[PDB]
A paper describes a structure:
By targeting its receptors C5aR1 and C5aR2 on a wide range of immune cells69 as well as endothelial cells10, C5a promotes inflammation, vascular permeability and coagulation. Mirror-image aptamers, also referred to as Spiegelmers (from German Spiegel=mirror), possess the high target specificity of conventional aptamers and are in addition plasma nuclease resistant, therefore having high therapeutic and diagnostic potential. Here we report the crystal structures of NOX-D20 in complex with either murine C5a (mC5a) or its C-terminally desarginylated version mC5a-desArg, at 1.8 and 2.0 Å resolution, respectively. The structures reveal a complex 3D architecture for the Spiegelmer, including a left-turning double-helix and an intramolecular G-quadruplex stabilized by a Ca2+ ion.
The structure of the NOX-D20:mC5a complex was determined by single-wavelength anomalous diffraction (SAD) phasing using crystals derivatized with Os(NH3)6. Unexpectedly, the asymmetric units of both NOX-D20:mC5a and NOX-D20:mC5a-desArg crystals contained three molecules of mC5a and only two molecules of NOX-D20. The final models encompass residues Asn679 to Pro750 for mC5a, Asn679 to Lys744 for mC5a-desArg and all 40 nucleotides for the Spiegelmer. NOX-D20 folds into a compact V-shape with the concave face of the V wrapping around the C5a molecule along the H1-H2-H3 side. The two binding partners display a strong shape complementarity, resulting in a total surface area buried at the NOX-D20:mC5a interface of 1,791 Å2, as estimated with AREAIMOL24. The two Ca2+ surrounding the Mg2+ ion are heptacoordinated by water molecules, oxygens from the phosphate groups of U5, G6, C31 and C34 and, for the most peripheral calcium ion, by the side chain of Asp705 protruding from mC5a helix H2. Within the complex, mC5a inserts into the V-shaped groove formed at the interface between the two structural domains of NOX-D20 and the Spiegelmer's binding pocket almost perfectly complements the surface shape of mC5a helices H1, H2 and H3. Lys701 and Asp705, located in the middle of H2, form hydrogen bonds with U5 and G32 phosphate groups, along the minor groove of the NOX-D20 stem domain, and with the base of dU28. Comparison of the footprint of NOX-D20 onto mC5a with the position of the C5a residues presumably involved in C5aR binding reveals that NOX-D20 strongly overlaps with the first C5aR-binding site.
Author numbering: 678 to 746
Amino acid sequence: ANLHLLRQKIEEQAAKYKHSVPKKCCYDGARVNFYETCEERVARVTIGPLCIRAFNECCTIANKIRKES
Ligand SMILES: [Ca+2]
Ligand SMILES: [Ca+2]
Ligand SMILES: [Ca+2]
Ligand SMILES: [Mg+2]
């Protein structure tokens, strides 16, 4: 994968969340890289819509970057 680009793009998106809790949701989302899809994995995130959106968007960004490497 392109870990330098990955870091950069996740930083870009994480900066949009203005609290450390949804920031962490983003960062955790971007770590998703096993057999579960972003949709499957986010289904178990239960701390609110912002957290869910952050997880989703960062997981999707990370997935795109890994696929394109
Ligand atoms: Ca912190
Ligand atoms: Ca977690
Ligand atoms: Ca605990
Ligand atoms: Mg935990």
